[PDB]
Amino acid sequence: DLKGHSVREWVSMAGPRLEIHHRFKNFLRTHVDSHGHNVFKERISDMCKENRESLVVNYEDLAAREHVLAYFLPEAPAELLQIFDEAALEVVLAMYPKYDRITNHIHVRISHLPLVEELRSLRQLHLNQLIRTSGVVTSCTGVLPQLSMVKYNCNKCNFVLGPFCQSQNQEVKPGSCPECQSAGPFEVNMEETIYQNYQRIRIQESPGKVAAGRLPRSKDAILLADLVDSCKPGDEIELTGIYHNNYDGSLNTANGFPVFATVILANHVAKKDLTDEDVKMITSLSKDQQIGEKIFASIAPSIYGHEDIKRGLALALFGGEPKNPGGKHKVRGDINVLLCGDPGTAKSQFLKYIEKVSSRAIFTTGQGASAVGLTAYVQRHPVSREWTLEAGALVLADRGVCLIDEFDKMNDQDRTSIHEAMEQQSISISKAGIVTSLQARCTVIAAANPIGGRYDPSLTFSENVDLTEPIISRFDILCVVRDTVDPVQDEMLARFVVGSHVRHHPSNGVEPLPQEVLKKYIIYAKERVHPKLNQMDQDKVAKMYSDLRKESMATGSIPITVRHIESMIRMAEAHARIHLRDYVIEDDVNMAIRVMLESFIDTQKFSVMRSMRKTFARYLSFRRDNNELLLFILKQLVAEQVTYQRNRFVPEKDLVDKARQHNLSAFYD
Amino acid sequence: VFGRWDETKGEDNIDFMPTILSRFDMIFIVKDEHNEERDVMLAKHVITL
Amino acid sequence: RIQETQAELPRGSIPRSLEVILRAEAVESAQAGDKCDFTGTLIVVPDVSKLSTPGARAETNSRVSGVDGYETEGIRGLRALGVRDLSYRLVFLACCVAPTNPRFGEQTAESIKNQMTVKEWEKVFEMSQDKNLYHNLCTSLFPTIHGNDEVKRGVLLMLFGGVPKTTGEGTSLRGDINVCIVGDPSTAKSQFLKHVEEFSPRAVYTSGKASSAAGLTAAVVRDEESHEFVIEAGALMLADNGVCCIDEFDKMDVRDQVAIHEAMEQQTISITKAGVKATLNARTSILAAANPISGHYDRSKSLKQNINLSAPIMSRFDLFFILVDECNEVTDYAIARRIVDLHSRIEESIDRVYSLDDIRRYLLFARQFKPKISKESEDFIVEQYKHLRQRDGSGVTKSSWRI
Amino acid sequence: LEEAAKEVADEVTRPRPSGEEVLQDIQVMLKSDASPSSIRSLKSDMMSHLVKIPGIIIAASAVRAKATRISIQCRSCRNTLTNIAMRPGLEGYALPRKCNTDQAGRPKCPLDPYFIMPDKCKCVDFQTLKLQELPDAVPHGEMPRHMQLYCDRYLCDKVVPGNRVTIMGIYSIKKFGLTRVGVGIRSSYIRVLGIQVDTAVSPQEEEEFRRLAALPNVYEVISKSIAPSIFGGTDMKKAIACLLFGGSRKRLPDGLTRRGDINLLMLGDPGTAKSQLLKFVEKCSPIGVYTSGKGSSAAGLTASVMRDPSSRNFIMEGGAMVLADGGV
Ligand SMILES: Nc1ncnc2c1ncn2[C@@H]1O[C@H](COP(=O)(O)OP(=O)(O)OP(=O)(O)O)[C@@H](O)[C@H]1O
Ligand SMILES: Nc1ncnc2c1ncn2[C@@H]1O[C@H](COP(=O)(O)OP(=O)(O)O)[C@@H](O)[C@H]1O
Ligand SMILES: Nc1ncnc2c1ncn2[C@@H]1O[C@H](COP(=O)(O)OP(=O)(O)O)[C@@H](O)[C@H]1O
Ligand SMILES: [Mg+2]
Ligand SMILES: [Mg+2]
Ligand SMILES: [Mg+2]
Ligand SMILES: [Zn+2]
Ligand SMILES: [Zn+2]
C-alpha cells in the first residue's frame, strides 16, 4: 500500500511485507506477453529446465501491471528483492515441487530500469537505491567462495554452531557456544558451510561518454553466485544494482576525512554486443564453385585493390596442414605472411582486418606501445598484483594469428623471440626458477617498411627489408607492396577514401560474403576438412622445381630451395581447405604454385625478376582470364608514354605485338 | 658470411676465428649442389614425406 | 589539489600546492588543468604528523596521579592523561567554484549560442560573416612574427581541427591536424608555439627532454581517503581537446617518442599501473618544433635525412613547415623593423582586428560544426589529390617528402 | 585412510630391527585417472571437495617446517600438555587459557600460562606453490587465473616451477580465526593430495640395448635411424650419431681432465635442412637444448650469476650451456 513513514521501514513492517508478497505472487502468476502468452510461465519453465536460479523481471512490465511495486523497488531495493526472491521461490516450487533440491533460492533480476545514471553522476542522494549505469569492465577478480550460510566449530568442545546468514555488510561473529557457553575462539567449519561465488569488478565511464577534459570515473561492483563470469575485462556492460554504502568502509583510521568507500551490489548485468544451419549453408557455398574468388574478394572490404595481398591473406587465414613424420621431423602447417611496403599502402589496415576477422588474433607492434609483447617474462601483474608468467604475444596465439606490425623496428630480444617462435614454434623461459618450454604455434602476419622508406626493385627484397635472412626465410608469402603514381589507381583509391569519409560522417566480379558467414566458413574449414596430398603431380612439381633452380643460377639471384616447395605444399593444402575438397586438386596445386612463384619472383631484383617472369609466365598466367594480362600490358605501355611526355614537355601495333609475345575485341569490350 | 658459399672466395666466406674453429671436433661444409637428378629426387622425397 | 599560478611565484620558489575541498553542488565543478577561482574559507585539519620532535601536547586539566602499580608514567600515563599532539594542516573549503577567466559572459552549437551573451554572439556572427577572415585571424593571432604566412595558416587550421569519424567496422578516422615546424635557428618556431599556448585554452608546453613518460601521459596514485585510485593527468591529457606544443621535439627521448607516437596515432593512452587499468581519450593536436640535424636545414636533402624523427612520427604529421633562414637583406630589414618597433612601442604596435577572447569564443563556437563533404567537393578533392600525386612523378625535381 | 595405512605398515613390518621400533606415520598420496577440470570451473560448489586441476607452476617456496603435533608447558607449575594434534593444511591453533593441572589448593596458575616446547614437537615439511591456468586453457581475451597450493611431507620438492602438473587436492580456505570491501571472503587454496607431472631401465630394455649393440651393422642402423626423413648426408648423420654417443671423459692423475664430448659445426647454404637436423638431435639426445646464437626467448646461452639485494643469495640464471649439462 502507500501510507505511514519512509519506504524502507514501511516495507520492512510485516503487514505491508506480506501484502507486497501476495501482490508480486499474483503478478508473477498472472501476466501476458501483450498477446495473451503467459510470459512468466515459460520463463520459469526454461529457468528450471536449464537450472539457472535467476528469473529476469522486466521493470516496464512490473510498472505496467503493479505500479506500487515499481515505485517501491528503487527506494528500498534490498527488502523488495528479498520479498521477490521468496515469492519467486514459492511459485517455482509450486510449478516444480522437485526443484527445491537444485537451488532452494531464486534471484529476481530487474531489467530495463527507466533512469540510467552515469558513474560521474552518482552522489550520496542515490545511496541505498537501485540504479542503472553503463560502463567498461576494467578489472575483474576471479570467482571467490564467499560465506553464505556459515557453520562454526567451537574449538573448546567441538560443537557446531549452526548456520548464520553471512550478510554483505558485516562479518558474522557468533556469540557463545550453545553447549559450553564459551565466547572463546571459533573457527569456520568449511565442510558444513555453504558458499556463494563472489566476484569484484571495476567499471569505468566509457571514453566516448567521457567529455571535455574530464577523467573517467570508476566504480566497484559485486557479483554474487549468478552474475559471476558474466563479464570480462574490456566488455561494455550495463549494470543495475544497489548503490551500497555501509559494509566496513568509512576511513575511521584517522587517515583523513570521514568519507565512505561506496560499492555497487550488482543485481543485473547486460552486455552490449554453434553451426547447424550455418553448416547446412556453408556446404552449398563451397559447392558454389566460385567460393575461392568470393573469399578473396570478401577479405578486407574496406581496402581497395591489393588482390594478391588479399589472396595471400585468405590462404594464411585458412592455413595449411601440420605434420610430423614419426615424432622427429616436425613441419609447420602455418602460412606466414610478410607485407613489406612503403608508407601509405594499408599494411596496418590489412593487419587490423585480420585481427577483426580471425579468432585468436593478437596485434603486437615492433615498438613498445603494445598491450602485449613478443618476449615472455614473469612478474607481478600491475593490476592483479599477482605473480604471473606473462607469456608473449607469440604464445597468446598458440593456435591463431600474431599480427606483428612494424616488423623491421624490433629489439634484439624481440627478434630472437620471433626467430625462436618461427623456427621452433616454442618459447623457452629460464627466468626466475621457471625453466619451461611452452608451445606457440601461431601464424605470423608481419608488416614492414623498406630501408629508406621506399622500396627499390633495383635491390633484392632481403637487402630492401632491413631483416635478417633467417627471419625472412620462415615466411611463406612475401608481399612487396610497392607504391607507384598510377593515374587510374590514384583516382579509384581517392574515390574509395572520400566515399568512406562521406558515408561515415557522424551526422548519419562476385558479391563478397558477409563477414559473419566468412568467419563461420573459416571455423568449419579449419575444424573438419583436412586436405590430403595423395593426388598431386610429383613429376610436374619436381620438373618445376628443377627448372626454377636452373633459372635461379642462370642469373645472379637468390636460389629456390626445398623450403619453397614445402610452402607451395602448404598453400595447396590451404586452397583445398578453402574449397573443402579434402583432396588437393591440380587446380589447387597450380594456384599454390602461382602464389609461390609470384612471391619468389618479386623477391628478386629487376634484372632477374623480369627474366624469371618471362621464363615462367606459364605458371604465373594460371587462373588468369587473359584480360588482366592485357590490361597490365596496356598500363605499362601508357606509363612509359606518360613518363616520356612528362619529361620531354598508344598505337594498336604495340598492344598487338605484346599480345603476340590475338583477340583484342574482348579486351576492348 | 655472404649467404652462399661462393667457392671462388675460397676462405673469405667464413669469418670464424681460428681459435673458435679449433674448438669444433668436426666441421662440415654444406653446399647445395644442383645436380638435376638430385634436385628431382629431393623434390619427390619431400612430397613423399 | 591545486597549485599556485605562475603569475604569483616569488623568485626562485616552487609553487605552493594545497588541497581544497568541494562540497555538495560544486563537488565536480573543477577539472584538471583549469584555472579555477575558489571562493570559501581557509581551515585547519588535524594531522597525523610524523614529526619526531614533540610539540603542542593537549591533555586533561584534571589533576590525577596514578597509584602504586598504575603510575601515570609511560604510555599508560600518556593514555590516562589523554595526551594528543596538536599538529595541523592548512586546507581550503570552497563553497563555490568558477574559472578565473570566463570564456563567456553536453555541448552543441546551440548550447554555445545560448551560453554566450547577446553581444558576444553578435560579435561571433559578424566575424564569421566577415570576409578574408582567414588572413584576419592569422594576423590577429601572430601580430609580432613576420612572414611565415604558410606556417600561420597551418597553425590556424590546426587550431580549428577537422571532423573525427568512426567507420562501421569500428576503425576511427582521425580528424585532428598535426603540424611540425623544422628550420634554422631563430626562425620563430618557439614563438609560434608560445603564441599558440598563450592563446588557446587546453594548450600545454613541453620541451625536448624536460618531461618524463609518466608526466607526459599519466600517472596513478592511490586515494588516501578511500580504496580508489586517482589518475594524475599528463601534458597530453591536460591538452586533450586542445593543443600540445612540443618544442625541441627532435631531442625527445626514445621512450617519450614512442609514447607521443601512440598518442598521435590511436588518440588514447593506456595505463596498467599501481593496481588499476584505464584507457583515457587524448584528442590532442600536436604542434611540434624540431631542429634539423647539424642545426641548419640542408636544402639538398629530404626531411628524412634532415630531421631525426622516426618514420612513423613523421608520417603522423599532417603539415611539415620548413623555415630556412634566407640570407636576404630585404627580409632581414623587415624582421629588424618588426622586432625594433615591437621593443620600442610595447603597448602599441599591436593592432589586432579581432580580440583574443573574441577569437577564443568564435573558435569554441565553430568547433561544434561538423561540415559534411558534398559531391562536387568530393570530385574536387579527388582532382586535387590527382594533381598532387602527379607532382610526384619522375623527371620533375625530387620533393622533400613523397605524396 | 592414513591411519589405516599406518596400521597396515605396522602389520607388514612388525618384526622390525632394533633401533627402528617406533612406528612412523604414512602419507597416502591419492591419484586418479579422471579427466581434470578447468581452474575456472572451481566454484563455491566444490569448496572442501576433492577437486582435480591442471596448471603450470610459477613459484615454489622453500621447504619450511610445520608442526603436526605440538607440546606446551605451564610457566608456573611446569606441567606439560604433550601431543596436541595440529589441524593439517594452512590452519592455525589457539593455545588454552587455563592450566589443566589438578590444583592442590595453591594459588592457581596464571591466565595464559602455556609456552610452546619447540624441542617436544613433531614437525613436517611444508611447501607453498603457485599454480597458473594453462596458457591454452586461458580464454582468448582473459588474464590467467592463479591458485595457491599447500604441499606436505612428500609433495614438497616434487615439482619445480615451470612444470606442467595435474593436482588433486581439497579446495579449501585459510583458517586463522576469522580475524576493506571483501566481507566474508577467506583466501582460498588447494591442499594438494596428489601431484602428477605432465611430461629407469628394465632388464628387458637392457637386454634389447645389449643385443642392439651386438648387432654387426649397429653403426649403420643408428646412422640411418637418426634422420631417416632427411635426404642424403650419410656422413653428416654418422657424425651426428658420433656426437650423440660422445667420447670418453678422462681425469688424469695430475688432475687435468680431458673432455669426451664431440663438437660439430655445420656451415652451409640456407637451403639445406641443418636446422631440422639440429631439431632432431635436440629431441633425440637424453638431455638436449636447442638455442640460437643469441639465446632463446627469455633464456640465455650461458649462465649468469647475480646477487639478490634483499636476501643476498646468489641467483644463477641457467643458460643453455649449463642447462644442457651432460647432454647436447
Ligand atoms: N588501398 C587502400 N584503400 C583504401 N584506403 C587506403 C588504402 N591504402 C591506404 N588507405 C588509407 O590511407 C591511409 C593510410 O593507410 P595506413 O595508415 O594503414 O598506412 P600504412 O600502410 O599502415 O602505413 P605505414 O607503414 O607508413 O604505417 C589510411 O587512412 C588508410 O585507410
Ligand atoms: N621571422 C621572424 N619574425 C619575427 N621575429 C623573429 C623571426 N625569426 C626570429 N625572430 C625572433 O627571434 C627570437 C628567437 O627565435 P626562436 O623562438 O628562438 O626561434 P627557434 O626556436 O626556431 O630558434 C624570437 O624571440 C623572435 O622574436
Ligand atoms: N635434404 C633435405 N631433406 C629433407 N628436407 C629438407 C632437405 N633440405 C631442406 N629440407 C626442408 O627445407 C625446410 C627448411 O629447412 P631449414 O630447417 O630452414 O634449414 P636452414 O635452417 O638451413 O634454412 C625444412 O622443413 C626441410 O624439411
Ligand atoms: Mg602501418
Ligand atoms: Mg627553439
Ligand atoms: Mg636455420
Ligand atoms: Zn563450545
Ligand atoms: Zn600450571
PDB file of C-alpha atoms in Angstrom, chain A residues 101-192:
ATOM      1  CA  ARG A 101      16.811 -29.791  -4.347  1.00  0.00           C
ATOM      2  CA  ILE A 102      18.568 -27.773  -7.082  1.00  0.00           C
ATOM      3  CA  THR A 103      18.715 -24.177  -5.832  1.00  0.00           C
ATOM      4  CA  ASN A 104      16.348 -23.538  -2.873  1.00  0.00           C
ATOM      5  CA  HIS A 105      16.682 -19.842  -3.789  1.00  0.00           C
ATOM      6  CA  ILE A 106      15.647 -17.694  -6.758  1.00  0.00           C
ATOM      7  CA  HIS A 107      17.284 -14.381  -7.675  1.00  0.00           C
ATOM      8  CA  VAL A 108      14.934 -11.826  -9.238  1.00  0.00           C
ATOM      9  CA  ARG A 109      16.979  -9.737 -11.678  1.00  0.00           C
ATOM     10  CA  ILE A 110      15.322  -6.436 -12.555  1.00  0.00           C
ATOM     11  CA  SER A 111      15.755  -5.188 -16.110  1.00  0.00           C
ATOM     12  CA  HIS A 112      15.122  -2.084 -18.211  1.00  0.00           C
ATOM     13  CA  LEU A 113      15.132   0.367 -15.332  1.00  0.00           C
ATOM     14  CA  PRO A 114      13.965   3.733 -16.724  1.00  0.00           C
ATOM     15  CA  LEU A 115      16.661   6.065 -15.395  1.00  0.00           C
ATOM     16  CA  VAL A 116      20.249   5.362 -16.455  1.00  0.00           C
ATOM     17  CA  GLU A 117      22.816   7.143 -14.279  1.00  0.00           C
ATOM     18  CA  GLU A 118      26.411   7.589 -15.406  1.00  0.00           C
ATOM     19  CA  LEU A 119      29.179   6.893 -12.915  1.00  0.00           C
ATOM     20  CA  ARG A 120      30.114  10.575 -12.666  1.00  0.00           C
ATOM     21  CA  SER A 121      26.576  11.466 -11.517  1.00  0.00           C
ATOM     22  CA  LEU A 122      26.426   9.068  -8.548  1.00  0.00           C
ATOM     23  CA  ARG A 123      26.000  11.085  -5.342  1.00  0.00           C
ATOM     24  CA  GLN A 124      25.008  10.470  -1.736  1.00  0.00           C
ATOM     25  CA  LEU A 125      21.416  11.028  -2.885  1.00  0.00           C
ATOM     26  CA  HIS A 126      21.493   7.708  -4.761  1.00  0.00           C
ATOM     27  CA  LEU A 127      22.693   5.771  -1.703  1.00  0.00           C
ATOM     28  CA  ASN A 128      20.688   2.642  -0.865  1.00  0.00           C
ATOM     29  CA  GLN A 129      18.734   2.692  -4.116  1.00  0.00           C
ATOM     30  CA  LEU A 130      18.501   0.608  -7.272  1.00  0.00           C
ATOM     31  CA  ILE A 131      20.390   2.380 -10.057  1.00  0.00           C
ATOM     32  CA  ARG A 132      21.199   1.589 -13.682  1.00  0.00           C
ATOM     33  CA  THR A 133      24.522   2.659 -15.190  1.00  0.00           C
ATOM     34  CA  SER A 134      26.744   1.804 -18.146  1.00  0.00           C
ATOM     35  CA  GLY A 135      30.471   1.277 -18.244  1.00  0.00           C
ATOM     36  CA  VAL A 136      33.506  -0.714 -19.314  1.00  0.00           C
ATOM     37  CA  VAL A 137      34.830  -3.534 -17.148  1.00  0.00           C
ATOM     38  CA  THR A 138      38.454  -2.594 -16.492  1.00  0.00           C
ATOM     39  CA  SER A 139      39.415  -5.303 -13.984  1.00  0.00           C
ATOM     40  CA  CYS A 140      37.639  -8.419 -12.747  1.00  0.00           C
ATOM     41  CA  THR A 141      38.773 -10.697  -9.934  1.00  0.00           C
ATOM     42  CA  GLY A 142      38.487 -14.460 -10.078  1.00  0.00           C
ATOM     43  CA  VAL A 143      35.462 -16.262  -8.650  1.00  0.00           C
ATOM     44  CA  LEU A 144      35.894 -16.248  -4.870  1.00  0.00           C
ATOM     45  CA  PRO A 145      33.967 -18.526  -2.467  1.00  0.00           C
ATOM     46  CA  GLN A 146      32.183 -16.197  -0.059  1.00  0.00           C
ATOM     47  CA  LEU A 147      30.478 -17.478   3.069  1.00  0.00           C
ATOM     48  CA  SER A 148      26.692 -17.691   2.700  1.00  0.00           C
ATOM     49  CA  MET A 149      25.402 -19.994   5.478  1.00  0.00           C
ATOM     50  CA  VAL A 150      28.396 -20.447   7.760  1.00  0.00           C
ATOM     51  CA  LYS A 151      28.705 -23.178  10.376  1.00  0.00           C
ATOM     52  CA  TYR A 152      31.234 -22.640  13.158  1.00  0.00           C
ATOM     53  CA  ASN A 153      33.350 -25.121  15.081  1.00  0.00           C
ATOM     54  CA  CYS A 154      33.746 -24.258  18.753  1.00  0.00           C
ATOM     55  CA  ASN A 155      37.316 -25.380  19.390  1.00  0.00           C
ATOM     56  CA  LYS A 156      36.688 -25.816  23.116  1.00  0.00           C
ATOM     57  CA  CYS A 157      34.111 -28.611  22.938  1.00  0.00           C
ATOM     58  CA  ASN A 158      33.912 -29.211  19.140  1.00  0.00           C
ATOM     59  CA  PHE A 159      30.239 -28.235  18.975  1.00  0.00           C
ATOM     60  CA  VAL A 160      28.994 -26.923  15.626  1.00  0.00           C
ATOM     61  CA  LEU A 161      27.215 -23.587  15.895  1.00  0.00           C
ATOM     62  CA  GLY A 162      24.536 -23.701  13.248  1.00  0.00           C
ATOM     63  CA  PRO A 163      24.186 -21.681  10.071  1.00  0.00           C
ATOM     64  CA  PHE A 164      24.189 -17.892  10.223  1.00  0.00           C
ATOM     65  CA  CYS A 165      23.303 -15.807   7.175  1.00  0.00           C
ATOM     66  CA  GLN A 166      26.533 -14.110   6.080  1.00  0.00           C
ATOM     67  CA  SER A 167      25.249 -10.685   5.089  1.00  0.00           C
ATOM     68  CA  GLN A 168      27.126  -8.434   2.673  1.00  0.00           C
ATOM     69  CA  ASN A 169      27.558  -5.655   5.261  1.00  0.00           C
ATOM     70  CA  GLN A 170      29.312  -7.042   8.352  1.00  0.00           C
ATOM     71  CA  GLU A 171      31.246 -10.125   9.352  1.00  0.00           C
ATOM     72  CA  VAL A 172      29.088 -12.649  11.204  1.00  0.00           C
ATOM     73  CA  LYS A 173      30.675 -13.069  14.636  1.00  0.00           C
ATOM     74  CA  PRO A 174      28.999 -15.737  16.808  1.00  0.00           C
ATOM     75  CA  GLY A 175      28.391 -15.130  20.482  1.00  0.00           C
ATOM     76  CA  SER A 176      28.651 -18.017  22.929  1.00  0.00           C
ATOM     77  CA  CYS A 177      28.744 -21.703  22.143  1.00  0.00           C
ATOM     78  CA  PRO A 178      25.256 -23.023  22.998  1.00  0.00           C
ATOM     79  CA  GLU A 179      26.728 -26.092  24.700  1.00  0.00           C
ATOM     80  CA  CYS A 180      29.723 -24.835  26.694  1.00  0.00           C
ATOM     81  CA  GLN A 181      28.633 -21.160  26.665  1.00  0.00           C
ATOM     82  CA  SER A 182      32.246 -20.207  25.926  1.00  0.00           C
ATOM     83  CA  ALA A 183      32.623 -16.995  23.939  1.00  0.00           C
ATOM     84  CA  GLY A 184      36.135 -18.167  23.177  1.00  0.00           C
ATOM     85  CA  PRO A 185      37.714 -18.727  19.781  1.00  0.00           C
ATOM     86  CA  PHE A 186      35.601 -20.117  16.955  1.00  0.00           C
ATOM     87  CA  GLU A 187      36.591 -21.476  13.556  1.00  0.00           C
ATOM     88  CA  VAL A 188      34.719 -21.711  10.264  1.00  0.00           C
ATOM     89  CA  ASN A 189      33.683 -25.312   9.592  1.00  0.00           C
ATOM     90  CA  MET A 190      34.385 -25.380   5.876  1.00  0.00           C
ATOM     91  CA  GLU A 191      32.806 -28.798   5.289  1.00  0.00           C
ATOM     92  CA  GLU A 192      29.459 -27.848   6.847  1.00  0.00           C
TER      93      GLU A 192
END
